[PDB]
Write a protein that binds this ligand. Sequence first.
Ligand code: CLA
Ligand code: CLA
Ligand code: CLA
Ligand code: CLA
Ligand code: CLA
Ligand code: CLA
Ligand code: CLA
Ligand SMILES: CC1=C(/C=C/C(C)=C/C=C/C(C)=C/C=C/C=C(C)/C=C/C=C(C)/C=C/C2=C(C)CCCC2(C)C)C(C)(C)CCC1
Ligand code: SF4
Lengths: 41, 732, 80, 75, 102, 62, 75, 35, 165, 31
Amino acid sequence: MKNFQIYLSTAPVLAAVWFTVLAGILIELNRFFPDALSFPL
Amino acid sequence: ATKFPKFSQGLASDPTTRRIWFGIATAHDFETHDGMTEEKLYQKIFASHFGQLAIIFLWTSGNLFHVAWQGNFEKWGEDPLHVRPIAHTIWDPHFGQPAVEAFTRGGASAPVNIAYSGVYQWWYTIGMRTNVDLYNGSLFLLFVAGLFLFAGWLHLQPTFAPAVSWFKNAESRLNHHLSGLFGVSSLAWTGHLVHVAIPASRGETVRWDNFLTTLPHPAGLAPFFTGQWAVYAQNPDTAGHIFGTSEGAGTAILTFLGGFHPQTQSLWLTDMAHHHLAIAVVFIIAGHQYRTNFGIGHSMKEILEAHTAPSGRLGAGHTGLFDTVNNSLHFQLGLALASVGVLCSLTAQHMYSMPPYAFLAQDFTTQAALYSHHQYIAGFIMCGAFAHGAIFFIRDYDPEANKGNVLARMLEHKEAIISHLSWVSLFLGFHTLGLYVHNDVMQAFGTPEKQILIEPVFAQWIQAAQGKALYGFDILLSGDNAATAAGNSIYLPGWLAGINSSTNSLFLPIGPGDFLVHHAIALGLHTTTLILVKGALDARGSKLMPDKKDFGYSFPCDGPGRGGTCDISAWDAFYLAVFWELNTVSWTVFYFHWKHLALWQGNSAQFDESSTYIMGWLRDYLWLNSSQLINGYNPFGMNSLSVWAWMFLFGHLIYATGFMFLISWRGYWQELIETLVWAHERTPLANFVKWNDKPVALSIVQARLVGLTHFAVGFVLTYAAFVIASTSGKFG
Amino acid sequence: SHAVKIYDTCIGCTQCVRACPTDVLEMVPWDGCKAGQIASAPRTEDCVGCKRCEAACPTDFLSVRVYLGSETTRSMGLAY
Amino acid sequence: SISIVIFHFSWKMQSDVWGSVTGNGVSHITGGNFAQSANTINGWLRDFLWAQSSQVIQSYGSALSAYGLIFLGAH
Amino acid sequence: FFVTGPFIKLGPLRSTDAAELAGCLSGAGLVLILTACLSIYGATAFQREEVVGLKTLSGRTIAKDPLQSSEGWASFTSGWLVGGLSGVAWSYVLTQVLPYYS
Amino acid sequence: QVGPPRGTMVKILRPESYWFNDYGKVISVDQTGVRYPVVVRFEKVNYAGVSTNNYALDEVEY
Amino acid sequence: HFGQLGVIFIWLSGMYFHGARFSNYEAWLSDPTHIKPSAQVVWPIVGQEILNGDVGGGFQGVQITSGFFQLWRGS
Amino acid sequence: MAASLLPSIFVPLVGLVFPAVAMASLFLYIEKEQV
Amino acid sequence: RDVQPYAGLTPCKTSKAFAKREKTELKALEKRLKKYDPESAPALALQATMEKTKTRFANYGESGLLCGKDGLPHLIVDGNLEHLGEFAIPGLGFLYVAGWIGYAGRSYIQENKTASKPTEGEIIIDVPKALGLMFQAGAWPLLAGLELKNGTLTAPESEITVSPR
Amino acid sequence: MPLSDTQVFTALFVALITGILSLRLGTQLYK
Ligand code: CLA
Ligand code: CLA
Ligand code: CLA
Ligand code: CLA
Ligand code: CLA
Ligand code: CLA
Ligand code: CLA
Ligand SMILES: CC1=C(/C=C/C(C)=C/C=C/C(C)=C/C=C/C=C(C)/C=C/C=C(C)/C=C/C2=C(C)CCCC2(C)C)C(C)(C)CCC1
Ligand code: SF4
């Protein structure tokens, strides 16, 4: 249990979770604000 | 022991085939020879310089003789735009009848090679017109080469052999080379241009026979010595002037028109004569700087000694560097190579954009071949300069004598230099590759408008400063201010005509593809410099191997211990940097060749459209322009490009064979040779014949070199075949 | 043959000697270290140059160093 | 080796087996050029690598644009 | 004798009526090259003492081969040259003479 | 007893040392007049993987 | 080995599931000669929807070359 | 006359004869024992 | 917005080549569409793609982009006020974010260096402390300025291991 | 106008002398 949490806190698992979430947010931003060549003004 | 390593006992007693290889390799490394004194070192270097200068002159005389004897120089001079130059006759026993009938170009009656070296345009521009003139020149250079061979022989005799101190006399050497080797030579070339090349360009042939009877200017030397030097610029050549004829031919011998001669699209010969004259004056003045035997002039040691920053930011300044440079042949060699490589790059970058030879701009294959030639030579020379500086740091650098000067300071903050080189290289490569991949994806996804196309406004702004009126900045020469007004008296009308014309390549229009490729070039230069500076500064030791200076310049490794030390030597840093040098030079010349091919077909939009993404280079440049090359020979006969197709595939072969030596390493091959030794020893009727030298695998450094040589040879030959065949198939 | 040099930082741990595959190195009495012994390279002619001694030397920087030089039959490790 | 086996397979099948019968003989993919061109390295370079690469390099703007991107990426 | 045959039947002039003469001149040229190779091998190979003797598998001590010496290899090279040129000429003769040759 | 006491952190001054300009704990100093008596232990390993070696009195600073 | 076989069974489960909810196998069944097999459809995010090629059957997706459709038809 | 003769002589001279003599000579020197 | 022409680049909104690019892509979309009957899902998906292309091209027109002869937008990165959104503002956003990432990393490595076994915590990341330092790294520019002014950003020369040279 | 045969052979003889001198220089270097 706690050890499993520690296992999750390992570098590979944490890298995979962090990049999964990051890719998710970036994909969602490119879905809701798509095709952004430059910052509008 | 054997006699071939006459200079190396340690190789003479070597019982293996490595003896032969390393005696070939270390032949010209005079400093590491048995019983070698400094005096013998310097005398042998002097005579070797004599020797290969004679080689250079024999090469030039051979080119002249072959063009005179087997070429079509006269006919080419008659119609420069519709006659392909001839290099030399081919007598190949292996040719078939289609090969003999397909290589017969020009007006030759035998198979020939089409001279892509530009020697025809150069010799036509300098006033040579007939095969007799070229033959006379070849014979004269044969005599010059014999003279230099005799001079090398003579200065190797003990009476005429000079001491070390004669070579160490820096002031006299530089005074004489600046005034005489540079300055007076430029003056003599000006005298040639004024007396021979310009009159030949204006129709009248001035050879030695009618030399001393035809004044180069209608006025004599009266305007010269009376100070009315502007008489020599009174009447320049008319715009409607045909080269080699008297139509619209002026009388001015020296001027600064600028731009290009309209009929030849090359520099005005009067401009180039005035140019060499000004250089002659500047360099003759410059060659009186240093003090030799007459109580006046500077002392270079004291020049360096007195240039120390008062704040101490530089440390002890340049104190102690005079002896460092003068006693270190590798320091001098690295400096000379650095400069020579920069010059070779400058020649590549100036001959394409400012062609100095008549009818060179119209011959596109020669332009491409010359640019590729000088850029690859420059890159190799640069790699040599940095390698020899690493060698200087190992063999010739004295930390005790150089204590506190800028060089020891370089050793002190080497980590900062290497780390910032790594940073700039990483930034450039990440962002350039990312922008290229992004553009690849956007083109792939059918939305090319979403590409990151950064307009290179800084280079465009420079061009606007320099007279280009495309972009509309209009600041310095494109605008109307003091700089342009000062320029518009002598040079600027011709310069503006040249730079704003769409035909020439004086300052080509710049787009986002040019941005991305120049940043790729910057990546290549920064990374090659990273590798080479790292090799030079860690040459004397690093944290992995503190005592690297005790192992010489080139050693295989320091064993598998301490994690592994493969490719740890500075020689290995050079070996690694040659790959990056070839890569960078290929990027530059790919850019050159594609941009110029687009210009020469008249559709520059192709490059400007397809150079922003890598698939465009792979498709519209490499795949597209390789069609006629690979069709040099096929099942339906062959044509004149079959030799270049064969060389293309040849270079591919060498490149791959190099990959063998680079990837597979010694110890597999050593065991394989051991099994082969057993087989030969136990084969009946073959054990009658026995090797004198024990067959062994190539050593680690040797094989690294062999693989690098194959890599580079295949690289150069493949690209030479491509750049020549495609350009000749589309333009001749 | 190659050149093998022993430096006074040697602690006499004998690992260079035990690692040598050609018996080039030997331990000799010496007062300089605590262990009371320094390595030496009498049979330098037999040094193939494999640098196992340098890999097995614990002292920083190495007390044994092999400098590759003239290559002989024995140094090249040839059975022929 | 595999690179040569699969190249032989692809060229031989496109040239001498695969195709479409239209009642007037076989119309192979590459037209049977293997038998007369696959005896030269130039033939493989030109009639197999260069010739058949037109699909992958001109795949941009279509569904095979992913194959083109992978082609570059794998290079 | 044999080395001529490849040049006859696969040389550049194999189709022409002069196929045999070309192939035999090629064979003679190759014999001359191999004579040069033999001469240089004989000059270089036998420079050492070779103090160790030779015995048969039965254990009988026997003298060294005179062929395995500089002058012996020179005599062998001369015999090679004469034999090779005679064999090339004989191959030419037989190609011009032999009934079932084609 | 000469040299740094046991347990103190000493700055390495040997130029070739992997831990040059680094700090290491003194384990022991040999008083029998050996050339390199100072045994220094290091948190970080070198390329050989060892964490300690011997230094002279002038190759350390505290 | 048990874990590898579990992984292989996951891969097979994925392939069959995609061939069920992300493919045109039923359309391909009626016209196998003219409909291109496809069992992968991409999300329309960054213009990658172009990879959903016109494989036929009133369907768009990445054309597959694993032969899974042919295997299922033969099964 | 030079054009019809000299190529057919010097191409084999430089590409078959000179290479043969040079390689043989260099071989004889390199394998020549020191003494 | 209406942007002045710059570096020989006309605005994309008034560029005929930009209109040609839009037209071409839309026509390609129509062609792709024609084979699908309108009721089927690919037809609606392609119509949505066409809509997306139209609104993208429109947005690029209004966003003050400069197009070239090719007809595709070109970025001005010299700092021009009229084109700051091309490089400066996203450049500032990247510099802020990248400095946040780096400062979170530097803070975690310096904090973990005080642990009993720093190298184990290097691979097994203390997630609560890590996240605390990550959210503290929101004010990276400030804290970096403090470190620079106090001299603790940069370690002194004597402490750093260097080559013997 | 092609080069005369005497011109070619004179230049070739000058080349032969140059080659002799190159051999003299090479031998002198080898010492
Ligand atoms: C380095 C310059 C150079 C080069 C690259 C060539 C190249 C060639 N020559 Mg030319 N040639 C040259 C100089 C040169 N020549 C000079 C100075 C002369 C004297 C006027 C000649 C006279 C000449 C004739 C008469 C003929 C050729 C022929 C040939 C062709 C091949 C046969 C051959 O090698 O015989 C060359 C013949 C020789 C007698 C040797 C001349 C070479 C010069 C004098 C020495 C150059 C040595 C070099 C710098 C250093 C070598 C050392 C090492 C690097 C190998 C080939 C295109 C033949 C040809 O066109 O075939 C189709 C032919 O008939 N050449
Ligand atoms: C006036 C006096 C004078 C002159 C002419 C020279 C000339 C020369 N010396 Mg020097 N020397 C002198 C005095 C002089 N020396 C004195 C007083 C000493 C004693 C200190 C020495 C000591 C000395 C040594 C120790 C050595 C020389 C060497 C050389 C030769 C170098 C090769 C060369 O020229 O590269 C060619 C260079 C140029 C013509 C100038 C370079 C200009 C740049 C790089 C290129 C510009 C080219 C231009 C744009 C046109 C190019 C294109 C065109 C071809 C199409 C050269 C012939 C070297 C040697 O041994 O050679 C035999 C050598 O090692 N010299
Ligand atoms: C004016 C220029 C100049 C001078 C005087 C020198 C002089 C020297 N160099 Mg430097 N060098 C130069 C240019 C120069 N080099 C350049 C441009 C490079 C970059 C390529 C180098 C790279 C370099 C390295 C890496 C090293 C030297 C070394 C040396 C020394 C010994 C050379 C040697 O080992 O024997 C002569 C060398 C050889 C015989 C090898 C040549 C093998 C070539 C590459 C084969 C090429 C194949 C051919 C072109 C293919 C034909 C075509 C194909 C179709 C068949 C000597 C002091 C070595 C040394 O010990 O320095 C002290 C050393 O380690 N130099
Ligand atoms: C195309 C081939 C290639 C590439 C990409 C590189 C890239 C690099 N080399 Mg190498 N190199 C190569 C060939 C190549 N080299 C060859 C054949 C040689 C001859 C041996 C060398 C010799 C060499 C030396 C000797 C040196 C380099 C250096 C460098 C770096 C230069 C800095 C730079 O451009 O950073 C930008 C970096 C890249 C373009 C690398 C790829 C990064 C990618 C784009 C990011 C990937 C992210 C993505 C999410 C990945 C998905 C994977 C997922 C499955 C995990 C870089 C890492 C130098 C260095 O270390 O400088 C610091 C250096 O010293 N290289
Ligand atoms: C197996 C096939 C083959 C062979 C043997 C040849 C042979 C020849 N060709 Mg042909 N050719 C071939 C295929 C072949 N070719 C094909 C397929 C094509 C395409 C259609 C051509 C196209 C072609 C053209 C267009 C020309 C030739 C020429 C030549 C000749 C070169 C002249 C010479 O000997 O210079 C001497 C040899 C050299 C200069 C080569 C130097 C290379 C070495 C390895 C450099 C490094 C040297 C190093 C120091 C070691 C030296 C050791 C030394 C002591 C032995 C020669 C007779 C040329 C000719 O006839 O001009 C006279 C010519 O112009 N060929
Ligand atoms: C799609 C957009 C995109 C993407 C994907 C990348 C991706 C990347 N960039 Mg790039 N970049 C972009 C847009 C993009 N960049 C733009 C628009 C700019 C203009 C501001 C830059 C400017 C930029 C610089 C200057 C550098 C990068 C670097 C990098 C790499 C590491 C960045 C990072 O946060 O590491 C995590 C961050 C850290 C470890 C902290 C390190 C320091 C960061 C990079 C900057 C903070 C320092 C401070 C503000 C002073 C800056 C000085 C500078 C102006 C010279 C990575 C490959 C770096 C690189 O690879 O070079 C070797 C790098 O130095 N980028
Ligand atoms: C703690 C994070 C961190 C920081 C602040 C730095 C800072 C620096 N690095 Mg280093 N680096 C790091 C991590 C870091 N690096 C990692 C993980 C690697 C391995 C990939 C490298 C590899 C590396 C190389 C190869 C080079 C640098 C260089 C540099 C300098 C240039 C700017 C830059 O980062 O561009 C480089 C940026 C990258 C290579 C991107 C990698 C950075 C990643 C994204 C950080 C990952 C850690 C992240 C914050 C999570 C940990 C914390 C979390 C648990 C809370 C600068 C001093 C260059 C230099 O010496 O310049 C003078 C150089 O050549 N770095
Ligand atoms: C390793 C080493 C070495 C080598 C190194 C190298 C190789 C380097 C290089 C370097 C280089 C290669 C450099 C370059 C540089 C350049 C420069 C510095 C340039 C400049 C320019 C200018 C200044 C300009 C100006 C102008 C302009 C902008 C334009 C117009 C005109 C004018 C003039 C105005 C040595 C031996 C030394 C030492 C030891 C070590
Ligand atoms: S050399 Fe290294 S290993 Fe051999 S004894 Fe001295 S210390 Fe122990």
